[PDB]
Amino acid sequence: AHGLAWSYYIGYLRLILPGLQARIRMFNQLHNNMLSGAGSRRLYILFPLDCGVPDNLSVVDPNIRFRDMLPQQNIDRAGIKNRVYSNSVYEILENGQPAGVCILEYATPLQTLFAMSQDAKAGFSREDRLEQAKLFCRTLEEILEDVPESRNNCRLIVYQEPTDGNSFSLSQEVLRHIRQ
Amino acid sequence: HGLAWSYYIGYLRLILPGLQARIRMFNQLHNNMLSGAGSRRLYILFPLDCGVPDNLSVVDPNIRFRDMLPQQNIDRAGIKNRVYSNSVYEILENGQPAGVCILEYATPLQTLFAMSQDAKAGFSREDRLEQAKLFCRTLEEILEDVPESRNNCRLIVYQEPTDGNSFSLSQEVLRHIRQ
Ligand SMILES: Nc1nc(=O)c2ncn([C@@H]3O[C@@H]4COP(=O)(O)O[C@H]5[C@@H](O)[C@H](n6cnc7c(N)ncnc76)O[C@@H]5COP(=O)(O)O[C@@H]3[C@@H]4O)c2[nH]1
């Protein structure tokens, strides 16, 4: 997970965080100032420690609704001309009402950990996977301390699903951060 | 081991099944540029010292960008229409175009390089070479069990000769196209 965390910084957050606010301003110009709130001008990244990462947020929560993409960012990377980095804007509902708008996505390496843990060859225990997911988050959190752009450009949302019958709403969790 | 799985799961598993279709479309738009069977695979560069320049022409001027394949869009981890893109290069020999292929570096190696230069990472130069070797070996293993979508990629693993001459990238790439 140490390698995965450094990879997520070096290969993604390092590249995308410095240009984010510029892309937000452009989005606001094209889309009637939709992301004008201070709570809306951050990349919110979901870290499900259980590592269940769907490709569509509607698979896990009906209240997280795709609206539009930010302008794409093109960067020449490792031989690939104009490799494209993209981010998606979601509206978060609360009892049918549009309660917040944000840029949202999952931390992609957690999807890798899931698939890897369950493979016949390279697999490892669920408990090892949870250890690794936590070690991934902690290592990324450590890395981002030397990165000043981190503080105002992203929000790390780390959580586990309950298995005891207690309520947890992902939409509610995102909204709580937006509203703060 | 972890980086190799990320590279398979998060990339090669996603793009290899769709590659031939993109190659057909590319050929329809660019005069069968990728006509030879040697030109119909993704060639991926694996420098064992983990040096990954972002621009291939800067490290070997006999390798020159021509065009991109059509983009592939996939919904990924909350990103709608995440974009996957590949680049086509011509390779010169004795100063004249002698081959054309889809070429790139294995991006995770650049992470290993960068880690070896940042003290926070606790990651030595020896650590780097070991992990680079392990990364390549692990990936070859993965691709065995995915026999389909072989014919779709070739791995070019290389290092500088121990007490030999500078390794020619363009010549290594032609050797693989022609093999
Ligand atoms: N060569 C190439 N072109 C691609 O489009 C591409 N997409 C992914 N990859 C490489 O595949 C492997 C896994 O990618 P994944 O997405 O899981 O994790 C990626 C992913 O979480 C993230 N990342 C990179 N690009 C994006 C992106 N565009 N959107 C979200 N995450 C990204 O940061 C991790 C490290 O990135 P790279 O170091 O480039 O290497 C990746 C990786 O080793 C690609 N490689």
Side-chain angles (χ1 to χ4, degrees), chain B residues 31-165:
Chain B
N31 307 311
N32 316 338
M33 192 187 297
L34 295 174
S35 58
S39 302
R40 243 66 128 74
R41 300 188 268 260
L42 175 61
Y43 296 93
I44 305 164
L45 300 172
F46 294 79
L48 286 176
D49 76 340
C50 297
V52 175
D54 289 310
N55 185 308
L56 273 160
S57 301
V58 189
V59 297
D60 189 331
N62 283 314
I63 306 180
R64 299 180 184 183
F65 175 77
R66 289 302 292 289
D67 234 292
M68 304 294 299
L69 301 183
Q71 292 186 332
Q72 155 98 98
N73 299 329
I74 308 176
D75 298 342
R76 299 276 300 112
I79 306 294
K80 291 292 195 183
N81 296 308
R82 181 163 168 188
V83 179
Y84 298 76
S85 189
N86 309 90
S87 290
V88 176
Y89 289 87
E90 61 172 18
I91 320 297
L92 310 176
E93 191 173 38
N94 314 123
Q96 295 301 320
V100 298
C101 66
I102 307 153
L103 186 63
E104 65 198 48
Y105 284 98
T107 55
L109 296 176
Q110 199 184 69
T111 285
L112 298 181
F113 197 89
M115 284 175 78
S116 71
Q117 306 302 100
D118 193 324
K120 310 181 262 179
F123 193 73
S124 77
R125 181 184 182 273
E126 311 90 272
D127 287 335
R128 177 182 85 215
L129 314 153
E130 180 187 345
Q131 295 306 125
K133 288 191 187 210
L134 181 44
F135 175 76
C136 300
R137 181 248 267 172
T138 299
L139 195 60
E140 302 173 315
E141 286 171 7
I142 294 172
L143 293 175
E144 277 157 19
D145 287 9
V146 317
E148 80 293 11
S149 287
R150 110 213 320 292
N151 308 343
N152 282 149
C153 82
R154 233 91 287 184
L155 311 186
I156 304 179
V157 181
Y158 61 101
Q159 61 186 357
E160 294 296 330
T162 291
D163 85 317
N165 308 340

Side-chain angles (χ1 to χ4, degrees), chain A:
Chain A
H2 178 83
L4 283 184
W6 273 92
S7 163
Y8 189 62
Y9 169 65
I10 295 291
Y12 184 60
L13 296 181
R14 185 184 65 162
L15 305 173
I16 184 196
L17 292 174
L20 190 69
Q21 290 307 321
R23 293 165 64 216
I24 293 167
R25 278 185 253 104
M26 174 61 134
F27 183 85
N28 280 336
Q29 182 187 299
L30 299 178
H31 293 104
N32 202 37
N33 230 32
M34 172 178 318
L35 293 173
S36 51
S40 301
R41 294 170 189 258
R42 282 178 173 99
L43 175 52
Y44 290 83
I45 306 172
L46 304 174
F47 295 78
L49 289 177
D50 300 313
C51 300
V53 176
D55 292 313
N56 314 100
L57 279 132
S58 76
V59 167
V60 301
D61 186 311
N63 294 317
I64 308 176
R65 309 281 182 105
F66 175 70
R67 295 293 180 244
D68 244 306
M69 306 295 302
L70 290 183
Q72 297 180 340
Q73 185 173 14
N74 296 338
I75 313 179
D76 290 353
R77 299 275 301 129
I80 297 174
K81 301 286 179 114
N82 296 316
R83 175 163 169 186
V84 178
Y85 294 81
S86 315
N87 305 93
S88 293
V89 170
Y90 288 84
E91 199 150 43
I92 313 302
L93 314 182
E94 186 180 63
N95 196 19
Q97 302 304 332
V101 181
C102 66
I103 308 150
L104 190 58
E105 66 197 49
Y106 286 94
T108 36
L110 298 170
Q111 209 171 47
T112 284
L113 279 178
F114 188 88
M116 187 178 177
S117 74
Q118 292 190 346
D119 206 85
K121 347 140 179 53
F124 43 95
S125 70
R126 182 180 61 181
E127 82 163 28
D128 283 353
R129 185 184 71 223
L130 179 62
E131 275 192 301
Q132 291 293 113
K134 288 172 185 178
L135 190 49
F136 171 79
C137 300
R138 280 271 56 238
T139 306
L140 189 57
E141 292 164 351
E142 278 170 0
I143 292 173
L144 290 180
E145 287 177 2
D146 271 337
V147 183
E149 322 93 274
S150 169
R151 172 138 119 119
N152 301 310
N153 283 287
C154 69
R155 265 305 93 83
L156 279 22
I157 305 178
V158 187
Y159 57 98
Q160 261 200 99
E161 300 293 324
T163 59
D164 63 1
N166 286 8
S167 289
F168 177 70
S169 156
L170 181 57
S171 61
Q172 287 293 298
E173 183 59 27
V174 173
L175 272 171
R176 182 184 108 219
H177 292 284
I178 292 173
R179 297 226 212 71
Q180 178 63 249

